[PDB]
Short mmCIF file of all heavy atoms in Angstrom, two decimals:
data_model
loop_
_atom_site.label_atom_id
_atom_site.label_comp_id
_atom_site.label_asym_id
_atom_site.label_seq_id
_atom_site.Cartn_x
_atom_site.Cartn_y
_atom_site.Cartn_z
N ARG A 1 113.97 95.16 89.61
CA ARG A 1 112.57 95.45 89.34
C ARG A 1 112.40 96.93 89.16
O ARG A 1 113.35 97.68 89.26
CB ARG A 1 111.71 94.96 90.46
CG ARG A 1 111.57 93.47 90.50
CD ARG A 1 110.55 93.05 91.52
NE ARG A 1 110.49 91.61 91.72
CZ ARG A 1 109.76 90.76 91.01
NH1 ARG A 1 108.98 91.19 90.00
NH2 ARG A 1 109.79 89.45 91.35
N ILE A 2 111.19 97.37 88.86
CA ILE A 2 110.86 98.77 88.78
C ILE A 2 110.26 99.26 90.08
O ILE A 2 109.47 98.54 90.74
CB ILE A 2 109.88 99.04 87.62
CG1 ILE A 2 110.43 98.46 86.29
CG2 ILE A 2 109.50 100.50 87.50
CD1 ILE A 2 111.81 98.95 85.89
N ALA A 3 110.56 100.51 90.43
CA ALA A 3 109.98 101.14 91.61
C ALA A 3 108.47 101.06 91.50
O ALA A 3 107.89 101.36 90.47
CB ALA A 3 110.44 102.58 91.75
N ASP A 4 107.83 100.58 92.57
CA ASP A 4 106.36 100.32 92.53
C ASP A 4 105.85 100.54 93.97
O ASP A 4 105.41 99.57 94.63
CB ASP A 4 106.12 98.90 92.06
CG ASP A 4 104.69 98.66 91.62
OD1 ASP A 4 103.86 99.59 91.71
OD2 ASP A 4 104.44 97.50 91.18
N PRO A 5 105.86 101.81 94.40
CA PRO A 5 105.42 102.12 95.78
C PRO A 5 103.98 101.66 96.04
O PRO A 5 103.67 101.25 97.17
CB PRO A 5 105.53 103.67 95.83
CG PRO A 5 105.52 104.12 94.41
CD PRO A 5 106.28 103.04 93.69
N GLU A 6 103.12 101.65 95.02
CA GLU A 6 101.75 101.20 95.23
C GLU A 6 101.70 99.80 95.81
O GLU A 6 100.80 99.51 96.65
CB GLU A 6 100.88 101.26 93.93
CG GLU A 6 99.58 100.42 94.01
CD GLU A 6 98.68 100.57 92.83
OE1 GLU A 6 99.17 100.97 91.77
OE2 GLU A 6 97.49 100.24 92.97
N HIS A 7 102.65 98.94 95.42
CA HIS A 7 102.62 97.52 95.77
C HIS A 7 103.73 97.06 96.73
O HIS A 7 104.01 95.85 96.81
CB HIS A 7 102.68 96.72 94.48
CG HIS A 7 101.47 96.92 93.62
ND1 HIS A 7 101.51 97.52 92.39
CD2 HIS A 7 100.16 96.73 93.90
CE1 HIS A 7 100.29 97.56 91.88
NE2 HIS A 7 99.45 97.09 92.79
N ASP A 8 104.31 98.02 97.44
CA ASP A 8 105.45 97.70 98.33
C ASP A 8 105.06 96.85 99.54
O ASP A 8 105.89 96.13 100.10
CB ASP A 8 106.15 98.95 98.80
CG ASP A 8 107.49 98.65 99.47
OD1 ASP A 8 108.41 98.17 98.76
OD2 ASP A 8 107.64 98.92 100.66
N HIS A 9 103.81 96.99 99.99
CA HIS A 9 103.43 96.39 101.30
C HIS A 9 103.34 94.88 101.28
O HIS A 9 102.84 94.28 100.31
CB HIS A 9 102.10 96.92 101.77
CG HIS A 9 101.78 96.48 103.16
ND1 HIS A 9 100.94 95.45 103.45
CD2 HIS A 9 102.31 96.90 104.34
CE1 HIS A 9 100.95 95.24 104.77
NE2 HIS A 9 101.76 96.12 105.31
N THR A 10 103.81 94.23 102.34
CA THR A 10 103.61 92.83 102.51
C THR A 10 103.60 92.52 104.02
O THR A 10 103.80 93.38 104.84
CB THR A 10 104.73 92.03 101.77
OG1 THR A 10 104.42 90.64 101.80
CG2 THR A 10 106.08 92.24 102.44
N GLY A 11 103.36 91.28 104.39
CA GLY A 11 103.30 90.88 105.78
C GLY A 11 104.65 90.72 106.45
O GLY A 11 105.68 90.71 105.80
N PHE A 12 104.62 90.45 107.74
CA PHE A 12 105.78 90.18 108.55
C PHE A 12 106.39 88.85 108.13
O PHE A 12 105.68 87.87 107.90
CB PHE A 12 105.30 90.14 109.99
CG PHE A 12 106.34 89.84 111.04
CD1 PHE A 12 107.48 90.61 111.17
CD2 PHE A 12 106.09 88.85 111.98
CE1 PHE A 12 108.38 90.36 112.17
CE2 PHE A 12 106.98 88.63 113.00
CZ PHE A 12 108.12 89.38 113.08
N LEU A 13 107.72 88.86 108.11
CA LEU A 13 108.53 87.67 107.76
C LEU A 13 108.16 87.06 106.39
O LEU A 13 108.09 85.84 106.24
CB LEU A 13 108.43 86.57 108.85
CG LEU A 13 108.73 87.02 110.29
CD1 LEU A 13 108.55 85.86 111.26
CD2 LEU A 13 110.09 87.64 110.43
N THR A 14 107.99 87.90 105.39
CA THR A 14 107.79 87.47 103.98
C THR A 14 109.11 87.00 103.41
O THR A 14 110.13 87.70 103.54
CB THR A 14 107.25 88.63 103.10
OG1 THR A 14 105.93 89.06 103.59
CG2 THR A 14 107.07 88.19 101.63
N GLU A 15 109.10 85.83 102.78
CA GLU A 15 110.33 85.28 102.19
C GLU A 15 110.88 86.26 101.14
O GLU A 15 110.15 86.97 100.46
CB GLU A 15 110.04 83.90 101.59
CG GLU A 15 109.40 83.00 102.62
CD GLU A 15 109.88 81.57 102.59
OE1 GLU A 15 109.63 80.91 101.54
OE2 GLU A 15 110.45 81.10 103.63
N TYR A 16 112.20 86.31 101.04
CA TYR A 16 112.86 87.29 100.17
C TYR A 16 114.03 86.63 99.52
O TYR A 16 114.68 85.79 100.12
CB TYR A 16 113.35 88.52 101.01
CG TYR A 16 113.59 89.77 100.23
CD1 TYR A 16 112.55 90.45 99.61
CD2 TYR A 16 114.88 90.33 100.13
CE1 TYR A 16 112.79 91.56 98.87
CE2 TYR A 16 115.08 91.47 99.39
CZ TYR A 16 114.02 92.08 98.78
OH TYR A 16 114.24 93.26 98.05
N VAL A 17 114.30 87.00 98.27
CA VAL A 17 115.29 86.26 97.51
C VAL A 17 116.69 86.88 97.60
O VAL A 17 117.65 86.18 97.48
CB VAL A 17 114.96 86.22 96.00
CG1 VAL A 17 115.96 85.32 95.29
CG2 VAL A 17 113.53 85.73 95.76
N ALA A 18 116.78 88.19 97.78
CA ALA A 18 118.10 88.85 97.81
C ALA A 18 118.93 88.46 99.03
O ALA A 18 118.45 88.01 100.07
CB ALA A 18 117.92 90.33 97.72
N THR A 19 120.23 88.68 98.90
CA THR A 19 121.20 88.30 99.88
C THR A 19 120.90 88.82 101.29
O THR A 19 120.78 90.01 101.52
CB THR A 19 122.56 88.79 99.42
OG1 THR A 19 122.76 88.39 98.04
CG2 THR A 19 123.63 88.27 100.28
N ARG A 20 120.86 87.89 102.26
CA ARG A 20 120.39 88.20 103.59
C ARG A 20 121.08 89.41 104.25
O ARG A 20 120.43 90.29 104.78
CB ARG A 20 120.59 86.95 104.46
CG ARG A 20 119.94 87.12 105.80
CD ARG A 20 120.29 86.02 106.79
NE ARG A 20 119.94 84.71 106.29
CZ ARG A 20 120.77 83.69 106.26
NH1 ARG A 20 122.02 83.76 106.76
NH2 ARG A 20 120.32 82.53 105.75
N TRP A 21 122.41 89.44 104.24
CA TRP A 21 123.15 90.41 105.03
C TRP A 21 122.95 91.85 104.59
O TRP A 21 123.29 92.75 105.30
CB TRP A 21 124.63 90.12 104.97
CG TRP A 21 125.02 88.78 105.55
CD1 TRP A 21 124.28 87.95 106.35
CD2 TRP A 21 126.33 88.20 105.46
NE1 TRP A 21 125.04 86.87 106.73
CE2 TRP A 21 126.28 86.97 106.17
CE3 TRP A 21 127.48 88.51 104.74
CZ2 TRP A 21 127.36 86.13 106.24
CZ3 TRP A 21 128.58 87.66 104.83
CH2 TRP A 21 128.51 86.50 105.56
N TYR A 22 122.43 92.04 103.36
CA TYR A 22 122.27 93.38 102.77
C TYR A 22 120.81 93.82 102.69
O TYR A 22 120.55 94.82 102.12
CB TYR A 22 122.97 93.44 101.41
CG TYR A 22 124.43 93.01 101.56
CD1 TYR A 22 124.81 91.68 101.44
CD2 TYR A 22 125.42 93.91 101.93
CE1 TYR A 22 126.07 91.26 101.73
CE2 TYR A 22 126.71 93.49 102.19
CZ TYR A 22 127.03 92.15 102.09
OH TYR A 22 128.33 91.77 102.37
N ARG A 23 119.92 93.06 103.32
CA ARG A 23 118.48 93.38 103.37
C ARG A 23 118.15 94.45 104.37
O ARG A 23 118.50 94.30 105.54
CB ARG A 23 117.71 92.12 103.79
CG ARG A 23 117.71 90.92 102.85
CD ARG A 23 117.01 89.69 103.46
NE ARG A 23 117.16 88.56 102.55
CZ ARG A 23 116.97 87.28 102.92
NH1 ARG A 23 116.61 86.96 104.16
NH2 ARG A 23 117.24 86.31 102.03
N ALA A 24 117.40 95.48 103.94
CA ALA A 24 116.95 96.51 104.83
C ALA A 24 116.00 95.94 105.86
O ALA A 24 115.34 94.92 105.63
CB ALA A 24 116.24 97.57 104.05
N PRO A 25 115.87 96.62 107.00
CA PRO A 25 115.03 96.02 108.07
C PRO A 25 113.57 95.83 107.64
O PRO A 25 112.93 94.86 108.03
CB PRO A 25 115.11 97.03 109.22
CG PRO A 25 115.72 98.30 108.61
CD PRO A 25 116.57 97.84 107.44
N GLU A 26 113.05 96.77 106.86
CA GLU A 26 111.66 96.71 106.44
C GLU A 26 111.34 95.48 105.60
O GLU A 26 110.17 95.04 105.56
CB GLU A 26 111.21 97.98 105.72
CG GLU A 26 111.93 98.31 104.43
CD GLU A 26 113.22 99.13 104.59
OE1 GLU A 26 113.76 99.25 105.74
OE2 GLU A 26 113.69 99.63 103.52
N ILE A 27 112.35 94.88 104.92
CA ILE A 27 112.11 93.62 104.22
C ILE A 27 111.52 92.55 105.12
O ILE A 27 110.72 91.72 104.69
CB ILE A 27 113.42 93.09 103.58
CG1 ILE A 27 113.84 94.08 102.51
CG2 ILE A 27 113.26 91.63 103.08
CD1 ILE A 27 112.88 94.17 101.37
N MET A 28 111.93 92.56 106.39
CA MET A 28 111.51 91.53 107.35
C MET A 28 110.19 91.88 108.05
O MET A 28 109.63 91.07 108.77
CB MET A 28 112.63 91.25 108.35
CG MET A 28 113.78 90.40 107.77
SD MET A 28 114.88 91.32 106.68
CE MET A 28 115.80 92.24 107.84
N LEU A 29 109.73 93.11 107.87
CA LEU A 29 108.60 93.71 108.59
C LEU A 29 107.41 93.93 107.73
O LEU A 29 106.32 93.53 108.10
CB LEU A 29 109.02 95.01 109.20
CG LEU A 29 110.12 94.85 110.27
CD1 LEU A 29 110.69 96.22 110.62
CD2 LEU A 29 109.69 94.14 111.55
N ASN A 30 107.60 94.59 106.59
CA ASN A 30 106.43 95.07 105.82
C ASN A 30 106.67 95.46 104.35
O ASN A 30 105.82 96.08 103.71
CB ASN A 30 105.74 96.25 106.55
CG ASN A 30 106.58 97.49 106.53
OD1 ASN A 30 107.70 97.48 106.04
ND2 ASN A 30 106.04 98.57 107.03
N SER A 31 107.80 95.05 103.78
CA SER A 31 108.19 95.61 102.48
C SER A 31 108.67 94.51 101.56
O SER A 31 109.45 93.68 101.93
CB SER A 31 109.32 96.65 102.61
OG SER A 31 109.70 97.15 101.32
N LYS A 32 108.21 94.60 100.32
CA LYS A 32 108.67 93.74 99.25
C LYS A 32 109.96 94.27 98.61
O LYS A 32 110.46 93.62 97.64
CB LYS A 32 107.56 93.67 98.17
CG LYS A 32 106.29 92.95 98.57
CD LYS A 32 105.31 92.92 97.40
CE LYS A 32 103.88 92.57 97.73
NZ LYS A 32 102.99 93.23 96.70
N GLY A 33 110.46 95.45 98.98
CA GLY A 33 111.66 96.01 98.34
C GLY A 33 111.39 96.60 96.99
O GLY A 33 112.25 96.45 96.09
N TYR A 34 110.28 97.30 96.85
CA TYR A 34 109.91 97.92 95.57
C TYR A 34 110.11 99.44 95.56
O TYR A 34 109.50 100.17 94.76
CB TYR A 34 108.45 97.61 95.20
CG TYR A 34 108.10 96.16 94.95
CD1 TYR A 34 106.80 95.82 94.73
CD2 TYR A 34 109.06 95.19 94.78
CE1 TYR A 34 106.45 94.52 94.44
CE2 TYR A 34 108.72 93.87 94.51
CZ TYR A 34 107.40 93.55 94.35
OH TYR A 34 107.00 92.24 94.04
N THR A 35 110.99 99.97 96.44
CA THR A 35 111.29 101.41 96.39
C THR A 35 112.80 101.62 96.45
O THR A 35 113.54 100.71 96.85
CB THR A 35 110.64 102.19 97.54
OG1 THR A 35 111.22 101.86 98.77
CG2 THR A 35 109.17 101.88 97.60
N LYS A 36 113.24 102.79 96.03
CA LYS A 36 114.65 103.06 95.87
C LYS A 36 115.46 102.98 97.17
O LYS A 36 116.66 102.64 97.17
CB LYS A 36 114.84 104.38 95.16
CG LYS A 36 114.41 104.32 93.69
CD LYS A 36 114.33 105.66 93.01
CE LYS A 36 113.82 105.47 91.60
NZ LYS A 36 113.67 106.76 90.89
N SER A 37 114.78 103.20 98.28
CA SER A 37 115.40 103.06 99.58
C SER A 37 116.03 101.70 99.84
O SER A 37 116.92 101.60 100.70
CB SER A 37 114.35 103.40 100.66
OG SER A 37 113.27 102.48 100.59
N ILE A 38 115.56 100.64 99.17
CA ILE A 38 116.09 99.32 99.36
C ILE A 38 117.57 99.27 98.96
O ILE A 38 118.38 98.62 99.64
CB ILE A 38 115.27 98.24 98.59
CG1 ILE A 38 115.55 96.88 99.14
CG2 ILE A 38 115.49 98.25 97.09
CD1 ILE A 38 115.02 96.73 100.51
N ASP A 39 117.92 99.96 97.88
CA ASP A 39 119.27 99.92 97.41
C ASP A 39 120.18 100.81 98.24
O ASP A 39 121.36 100.50 98.46
CB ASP A 39 119.31 100.40 95.95
CG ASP A 39 118.80 99.35 94.95
OD1 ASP A 39 118.93 98.14 95.19
OD2 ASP A 39 118.38 99.81 93.84
N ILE A 40 119.66 101.93 98.71
CA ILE A 40 120.45 102.79 99.58
C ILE A 40 120.87 102.08 100.87
O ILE A 40 122.04 102.17 101.30
CB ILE A 40 119.72 104.10 99.86
CG1 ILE A 40 119.50 104.88 98.54
CG2 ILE A 40 120.49 104.97 100.85
CD1 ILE A 40 120.74 105.48 97.93
N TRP A 41 119.97 101.30 101.44
CA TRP A 41 120.34 100.49 102.60
C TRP A 41 121.54 99.58 102.29
O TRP A 41 122.50 99.53 103.04
CB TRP A 41 119.16 99.62 103.07
CG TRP A 41 119.54 98.79 104.25
CD1 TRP A 41 120.11 97.51 104.22
CD2 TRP A 41 119.49 99.14 105.63
NE1 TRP A 41 120.41 97.10 105.45
CE2 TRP A 41 120.06 98.06 106.35
CE3 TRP A 41 119.06 100.27 106.35
CZ2 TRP A 41 120.21 98.07 107.72
CZ3 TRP A 41 119.20 100.26 107.75
CH2 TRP A 41 119.76 99.15 108.41
N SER A 42 121.46 98.88 101.16
CA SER A 42 122.54 97.96 100.81
C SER A 42 123.85 98.70 100.61
O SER A 42 124.89 98.26 100.99
CB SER A 42 122.21 97.20 99.52
OG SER A 42 120.98 96.46 99.66
N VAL A 43 123.80 99.87 100.01
CA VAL A 43 125.00 100.70 99.88
C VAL A 43 125.57 101.04 101.22
O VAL A 43 126.79 101.02 101.41
CB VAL A 43 124.79 101.96 99.02
CG1 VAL A 43 126.08 102.80 98.99
CG2 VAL A 43 124.40 101.55 97.61
#
């Protein structure tokens, strides 16, 4: 997707499609994964 900080926010325990083991902690807390930090975590 494209970086979209305006729309990153979401609720706790929002379903996510990417591979579980490489998900940043914020995916499970408050983030849709719309910022570059998501990929750095996976790295």
Side-chain angles (χ1 to χ4, degrees):
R1 287 188 187 273
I2 306 304
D4 196 358
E6 163 174 21
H7 295 115
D8 192 66
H9 188 260
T10 188
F12 179 57
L13 308 178
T14 297
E15 307 219 296
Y16 200 67
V17 185
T19 310
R20 189 190 302 130
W21 298 345
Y22 306 89
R23 295 174 185 163
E26 62 273 14
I27 295 296
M28 284 76 75
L29 296 168
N30 69 357
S31 178
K32 292 182 195 152
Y34 296 174
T35 69
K36 291 169 183 178
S37 62
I38 198 68
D39 284 330
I40 298 288
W41 179 271
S42 302
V43 178

